[PDB]
Amino acid sequence: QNPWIYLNEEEKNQILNFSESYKKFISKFKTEREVTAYALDKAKKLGFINAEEKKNLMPGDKIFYTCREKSVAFAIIGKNPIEDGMNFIVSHTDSPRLDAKPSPISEENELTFIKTNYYGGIKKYQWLSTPLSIRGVVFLKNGEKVEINIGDNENDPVFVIPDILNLKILIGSLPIETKEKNKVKLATLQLIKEKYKIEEEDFVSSEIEIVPAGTAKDVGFDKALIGAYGQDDKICVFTSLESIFDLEETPNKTAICFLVDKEEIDSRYLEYFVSDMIFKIKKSEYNNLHVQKALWNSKSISADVCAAINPEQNAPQLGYGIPIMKYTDAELVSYIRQLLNKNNIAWQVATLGKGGTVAKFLAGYGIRTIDMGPAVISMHSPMEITSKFDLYNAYLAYKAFYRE
């Protein structure tokens, strides 16, 4: 039946606007750090406060916990006793990219490249002959942090990985007049030094990942699809953040909107910040056994999207609802069935062969978890295709959840 049909111009416009926001978003923030900053700055406004500077913890309190520039907390304390449980969302900030080697700069056949190391489920041949953007953090010999972002931006140059007819990013040609060995390497190295104050070796340390350059676009004549890079869960990072973000009024039962990094596969940060909130709530009476009880009650949703079909009644389809995934607790599923149906939110079912890490881990603490995220096409490619209807749909699924 495809949900679109039962909508009206109003709702239809709500979707189209929410999607423009989503675009300006994934278009800008592509790396874990970048997305973290985005998230953080949004909550900084809207009124969220850092965990510290806060010994207090009252219903309606909007706070946030920072991990290490790659993960964030974001919690709005609810009316019910924090002991009776909380609701977590959890989505991963990272996505597949390249990561330059510790000592990446090298010259080959009169050309300078960056070494790089495949990260995530890359589709190799898809990264060949494509505009790339270098993004990184570099600490100098004196631990002075510097930031790079080249590829997007106006007039900005791009970098590629040539092909015929390993993974090395082309950085530059034309030499420098010197009796030194590799001239194109030096030539290029001086540029980077003159422009960034960076010297070779500053590359050890530092964190530099190569990302598909370019901006998100609309797919098809009907502009009903979004093709972009990072769709893998950034659609969830975005939608979940929104749902929790001041788009409500104090909720019964505390709301948590995690956002983890899979590089850190965070693995304990949950225990730490959740036990921190509990201590703020019961000073002289704090106690390990609480938390444990707090966590054991809580229910959580795991974002990470899932694949769809190209070119079965258990595979999802674009623009047909948020799918409730299951890899290959009925009572929790029942809770969401009703919850969604109650609000008239469109959902789907989905079985998967070979997100999972996050589903686990969460359930490892006692939190009853469920897998829910949109559905993607050309997954883990520089252009993952998603539906705008699903985008808004997810945001409604979440939130609706937060407001049980």
From Swiss-Prot:
| Origin: domain of life | Bacteria
Report residues binding Zn(2+): 92, 380
- Write down the EC number: 3.4.11.-
Alphabetically ordered keywords of this record:
Aminopeptidase, Hydrolase, Metal-binding, Metalloprotease, Protease, Zinc
GO molecular function (one)? zinc ion binding
Report whether Metal-binding shows up as a keyword of the record.
Answer: yes
Protein's recorded name: Probable M18 family aminopeptidase 1
What organism is listed for this UniProt entry? Borreliella burgdorferi (strain ATCC 35210 / DSM 4680 / CIP 102532 / B31)
